[PDB]
Write a protein that binds this ligand. Structure first.
Ligand SMILES: [Zn+2]
Ligand SMILES: [Zn+2]
Ligand SMILES: [Zn+2]
Ligand SMILES: [Zn+2]
Ligand SMILES: [Zn+2]
Ligand SMILES: [Zn+2]
Lengths: 836, 836
DNA sequence: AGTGATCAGTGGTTCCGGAACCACTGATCACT
DNA sequence: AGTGATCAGTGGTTCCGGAACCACTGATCACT
């Protein structure tokens, strides 16, 4: 059986009609913009999700004709849990299995002395008696109250047992036995208690190991790990400005120490002798939104003073397995956790219960390794995971949940993944497939393309040049006759990415020293300037930590004298050799309808002035503003410049319809009359970057921003192509162009976080190109990449590792691609060998 | 492959572990209470839904260990669309295909004169010219302005065409041609216009046939069909009581016609001369929640004065196909609509476009027939469909949507279905299966059980007697060795339901005459009294209409002098032969935690008094109230009687935990000390109906209500079994017992709407039994049923039909089962033959 | 000349709680 | 004796809108 799309014309799709094989690893490929995400995500996923949800208890319809074989679909991608209560543990369901394990095996200790607790059955004490006492001894059985009094004979077994038990009933689980002869006394408990102090540990159940249960969570943090401590970002007195009388009362006591109308001893205003600003705003928090107000403004979430950030109460933290309480265990990297579960030797009475439990835990602990997250710890906040880390956890969870019958759609799951781990991701993708799921992956990575069960190539190119199936079938087929597609060619060899054959050398260098932020091993980084630098290393090695959470803020402050948070470090040297810093991370473009490529990269400004220079617009009052659809005056006022009004009808969601006044041109007739070389302002939003780049050859300032958009490959996009309809690789690329178009000083530092995300072989080519051009002008470019085609072109490389997590944070290697490719201390080098 | 439940212990499930075959028609069967709904719905569906939804963009966990092979699951059952905009058409997606059809073919007429509109191409008029005019004529081509002036020669074809076109450009689609020789003039339009009046019909598109589009809906009702007309349920002046000054102004003008402080001429207060109460409260509606206030209270939704309730604007209503505008078409029963589409003979140029469209519409129009809803019309409000009608529409839609890979779980889909249509439902169930879905049906119907690909029988009996797989495998297997289950036996023949062999005769009769409510053909029903009556007939025949929406309210008013709405009719006769009327419809029990069987059927009252009679409770102040957990005094005040407190934690949903004070017994220690025959009040909520029925043999009033619960089969339920945890066949049965326990007059009328819903062969037996016992005491019992085992036992039958919809509403037949089984004018009789 | 650092105005996101309404319990009144 | 027709108190359902917050456009100022 197979999935059968027919009449697919979403976005730029050209009414295509493709048969996708069910239960296979299908990779959909294509140059960024081609619209293969519009087929994977906005058609297939979007309909399989729809058809399902609308069959439930309902509280858009993707433009397709029909789709046979469609199944409930799930999209996996970069989507953070947001709430403070999610750990890697909880999110993968693994923590729960753990909560049961610690419940079943694992001994409680004393919540204060740490001494292992003790309890005995009536079996165990009846047996104690016959060891400590001589058969024939006359004994008393008490209840802390005479219960029985007899002779310790084997013949009296049940009498003893009956009385032993009764003694615990009345004794509240406590029974005393006296050796009437010797005077020796023995007190016992059918329940857990400390020998050194006599306190009764709680009821051992999974609920106790749950920092999301009243039974498990810490008393003064509710299992969150942190509390809400007011922060001296409260200083006129910033949090008092909703009642002037407040500000005055303290001013009157200030004038009582002899001051008007900041002078030393500010410590009083802040604490008191009476009531300080701090404890007062802290009291307002307890004694009460306006609870929300003070959370956003004056409050910093600090670690829980009591549990230490361990979330669990004092008791739960006292149950141990081979020395580790459940939290301690979740702190081991998921691979240490694994071995711990293995070098675990439990009595066979124990290994009889745990048994399968223990296997169930290890099976999905592995799915985490198999996806390359073996460096994480379950204790890890879901909150603080990269997008790629999130993406691969959903993959492991979903393959763990063993759900079957669905169509999974993944967008570029190699994001954040070293070339070294690609092998294992493909192996997990195929496993998620062998549960009997259709796995559809939008990817650009060759290794993944080569492992596809079926490929579908969309193009030829972006925008109107896409929406067509330029190839479909097997890998062998595509490599047997590749003349058919740009993807086929980059695999065949026809097109390739050139290793610039001459390395560059610096003119100065940057030296950030003693970098201790996160897992970075108190390192000393020297960054060559005026060269193309790369930062590589396996996931978890510390790339983002160093480059983006330390190096970046730090320069921003030594350059803009600003107060940005940054990673721990000792010093920076030679920062005067750069005089501006531009950064482009992976975050998403702000999407409004009031925005298109032209307005976003600002070229439209220059174009608005050109139109306001036309004799006709000079003849009238017209200036540049007349030509903005976001400004009253020359836009269409029916639809406020939108090109559509909003029709309000009863009992239905609002529906937007074309503006009948302006026809959706979104300008008033008068403005549409001003023309340059024959076209009005609306006509100019209809042309592609390539079209506009021609039209404007002679207008230098315009042609420039345009050229950039063309150079990054975006040359095929409509200027007015609204921001919302923008694809991911475009939007990133526009955000890219928006920065790359501001003239450079010749000594600016460009920081790029995985710039090749959402980029095809082809787009990457134009990219490394543009980047080379940037350094020639004496500019420094740092990129964090796992993409080998971008790494071959660096003149310097700083390789972090050797592994991820706590087993990384080391500069394992540095030098040119070549110096790195000979270094056997580096994985990056081990793969950089087969491209040099 | 197969689904594999392991460690299933939801509700009364006994930790069972069943393998269900994937892609099969699986019927799960069992005596009502057995907990087979807890496995179908609360385990399988509940998890397949969960695992899916939690994989999406999340904004309980059914107690099971593991479930392999699980797929996204969908439950189909009695669940109304609630909104005023849903029709059968829209809900099945069929209307949309229709909107396209009327767009593609189907001629517009004049929105007022009804004269078919006309337009011509430049091709059509160029050709007209050469017919009307003699080749050689000199002509002028105008624009309503001389465009051209030439000679009508074939040699001038393009000149004419070019000018013809230009003439329409400037002419606004209008071109005039003069025969300069003859004086004859011809005006043409490239667009639709009326020859008799010259108005331009709108842009013909699907959006125009959409009463949910600004383009399609009616102007003064927005495609809803009705408006909001204030109703004289406004009379001190009920809608003026939020401003006394109002009531006074009118009182001062009343005292100006000479009245204080109702006297004839009330018409003024209501309308004015100045402003009446009605137009004013009507003005408050337009000129403005408090819009909501007046909707609930003083306003009645009346039909739209303009569109007539047709929803569509005047234009859309003017496009016709073979004489019918799109609404007219949706009024035909889905089977007339079908034939209409067939006896439709469209020109081959037409049948080339519509072609597949027309087939796509007919395919799913059939799924409606195949499920037995051929009697409906697309125009039918989704709002006013029975639960069973809803259920089978989702089935047709879902089989229409061709979705595949999911597990469908249906609860008793024969609800509302005549025995005659069961054949076709099974055929649809198997079709929904052959798309490659697992179809799991909780059913009791033998015909469906016999068509199962795989059966799973749960029991032995209800409550603690269930939760076990008492058989699984094929139909043949079960009938080859049936000694294994109560279901197996009712098929084998071992157990059977006896046709009471002696019919009863009335002592009087009820005669409701001229019943015209809904589709009932102005009929005259005579109801025999003191006998067991049944009302039968195919879905849509009018059973609910007659018995429940006319007969019922009508008696309620002639008995309670109340003002209930009722179906249209002329008169009632002999209503004095009954002096009380009890009714039990299919609606659901109000579910609170403050309720159990014992409190619901009120027996717990009698039990509370017994406990307040105990010497110990007499010795103290205690009365009956002390023994209610819903009253302050003797319940547990920690948990307000709930048996659990609510723990509020941060950032997580509330979690309820056992009350540590009362241990979940929900009474304070003092009360728990009063005992009767050795058990406190809590202990008595723990015992089953059968247990309690023993315990209380000698307490007559108690034993009675209990006996009822035992007689309907409910003898196995915990008295304190909370209302929420109640199954459907139980809850209905409790609601049943709650009425059947009030002593009868000996002349009360009992009306039961499908009382055998959610009932097993076995429960039906105990039911017809109880019902017989009720008539012996001279009581009249009317039941609406399709269940043949209940119908064999009637002494009279009133068969409605012969079909559903407008082709029903006739009393096709009456008499005893036998008199009916010989009547070939009746389907009921045609199946009642094989059980007599 | 081109910038960045601003500000107003505007759109997208997201992240929650109440009011009204209806059903059940368990009491009394007004009775058969 | 047991009812139904009441009423208060309480729980379940359901059916919605704003405020705050953040991003983008496109202007001016203060400059290189
Ligand atoms: Zn201790
Ligand atoms: Zn804490
Ligand atoms: Zn407009
Ligand atoms: Zn007309
Ligand atoms: Zn209307
Ligand atoms: Zn309690």
């Amino acid at each position: 059986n197979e999935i059968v799309v027919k009449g697919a014309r979403v976005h730029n799709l050209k009414n295509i009609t493709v048969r996708i094989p069910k239960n296979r690893l299908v990779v959909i490929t294509g140059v960024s913009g081609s619209g293969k995400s519009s087929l994977a995500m906005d058609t297939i996923y979007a309909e399989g999700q729809r058809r399902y949800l609308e069959s439930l208890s309902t509280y858009k319809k993707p433009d397709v004709d029909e789709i046979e074989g469609l199944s409930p679909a799930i999209a996996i991608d970069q989507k953070t849990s947001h709430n403070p209560r999610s750990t890697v543990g909880t999110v993968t369901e693994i923590y729960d299995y753990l909560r049961v394990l610690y419940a079943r095996i694992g001994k409680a200790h004393c919540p204060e002395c740490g001494r292992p607790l003790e309890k005995k059955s009536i079996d165990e004490i009846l047996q104690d008696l016959f060891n400590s006492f001589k058969e024939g001894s006359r004994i008393y059985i008490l209840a802390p109250l005479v219960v029985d009094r007899l002779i310790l004979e084997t013949r009296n077994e049940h009498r003893i047992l009956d009385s032993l038990e009764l003694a615990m009933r009345e004794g509240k689980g406590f029974v005393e036995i006296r050796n009437v002869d010797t005077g020796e006394s023995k007190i016992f408990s059918e329940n857990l208690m400390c020998p050194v102090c006599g306190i009764g540990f709680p009821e051992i159940t999974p609920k106790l190991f749950s920092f999301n249960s009243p039974y498990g969570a810490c008393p003064n943090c509710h299992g969150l790990g942190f509390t809400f401590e007011v922060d001296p970002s409260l200083v006129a007195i910033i949090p008092y400005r909703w009642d002037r009388r407040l500000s005055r009362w303290v001013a009157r006591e200030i004038e009582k120490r002899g001051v008007s109308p900041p002078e030393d001893v500010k410590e009083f205003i802040l604490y008191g002798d009476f009531e300080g600003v701090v404890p007062k705003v802290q009291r307002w928090h307890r004694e009460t939104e306006m609870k929300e107000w003070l959370e956003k403004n004056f409050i910093v979430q600090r670690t829980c003073s009591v549990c230490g950030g361990r979330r669990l109460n004092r008791e739960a933290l006292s149950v141990k397995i081979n020395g580790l309480n459940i939290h301690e265990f979740t702190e081991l990297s998921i691979s240490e956790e694994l071995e711990f579960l293995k070098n675990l030797n439990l009595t066979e009475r124990e290994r009889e219960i745990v048994g399968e439990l223990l296997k169930e835990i290890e099976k999905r602990l592995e799915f985490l390794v198999d996806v390359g997250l073996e460096y994480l710890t379950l204790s890890r906040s879901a909150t603080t995971l990269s997008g790629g880390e999130s993406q691969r956890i959903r993959l492991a969870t979903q393959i763990g949940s063993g759900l079957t019958g669905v169509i999974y759609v993944l967008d570029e799951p190699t994001i954040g993944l070293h070339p070294r781990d690609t092998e294992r991701l493909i192996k997990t993708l195929k496993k998620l497939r062998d549960l009997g799921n259709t796995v559809i992956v939008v990817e650009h990575d060759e290794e993944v393309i080569r492992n596809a069960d079926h490929i579908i190539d969309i193009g030829p190119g972006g925008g109107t040049n896409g929406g067509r199936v330029v190839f479909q079938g097997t890998v062998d087929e595509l490599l047997k006759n590749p003349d058919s597609s740009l993807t086929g060619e980059y695999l065949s060899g026809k097109r390739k990415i050139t290793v610039n054959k001459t390395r560059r050398l610096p003119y100065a260098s940057l030296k950030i020293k003693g970098v201790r932020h996160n897992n970075l091993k108190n390192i000393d980084v020297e960054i060559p300037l005026g060269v193309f630098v790369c930062v590589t290393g396996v996931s978890g090695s510390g790339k983002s930590s160093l480059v983006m959470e330390t190096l970046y803020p730090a320069l921003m402050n030594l350059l803009h004298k600003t107060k940005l948070p940054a990673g721990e470090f000792d010093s920076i040297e030679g920062h005067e050799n750069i005089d501006k810093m531009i950064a482009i991370d992976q975050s998403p473009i702000g999407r409004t309808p009031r925005s298109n490529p032209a307005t976003y990269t600002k070229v439209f400004d220059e174009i608005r002035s050109l139109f306001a220079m036309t004799p006709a617009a000079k003849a009238r009052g017209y200036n540049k503003s007349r030509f903005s659809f976001n400004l009253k005056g020359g836009r269409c006022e029916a639809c406020q410049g939108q090109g559509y009004v909003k029709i309000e009808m009863l009992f239905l969601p609002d529906v937007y319809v074309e503006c009948d006044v302006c026809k959706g041109k979104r300008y008033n007739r008068e403005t549409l009359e001003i023309t340059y070389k024959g076209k009005n302002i609306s006509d100019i939003l209809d042309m592609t970057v390539d079209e506009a780049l021609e039209f404007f050859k002679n207008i230098p300032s315009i042609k420039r921003t345009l050229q950039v958009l063309h150079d990054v490959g975006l040359g095929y996009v409509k200027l007015g192509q609204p921001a919302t309809t923008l694809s991911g690789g475009e939007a990133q690329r526009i955000k890219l162009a928006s920065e790359l178009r501001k003239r450079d000083t010749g000594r600016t530092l460009y920081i790029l976080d995985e710039p090749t995300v959402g980029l095809h072989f082809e787009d990457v080519r134009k990219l490394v190109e543009v980047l080379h051009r940037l350094v020639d002008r004496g500019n420094t470019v740092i990129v964090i990449e796992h993409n080998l085609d971008v790494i071959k072109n660096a003149d310097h490389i700083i390789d972090l590792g050797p592994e991820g997590g706590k087993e990384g944070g080391y500069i394992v290697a540095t030098g040119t691609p070549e110096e790195i490719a000979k270094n056997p201390h580096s994985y990056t080098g081990r793969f950089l060998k087969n491209v040099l």
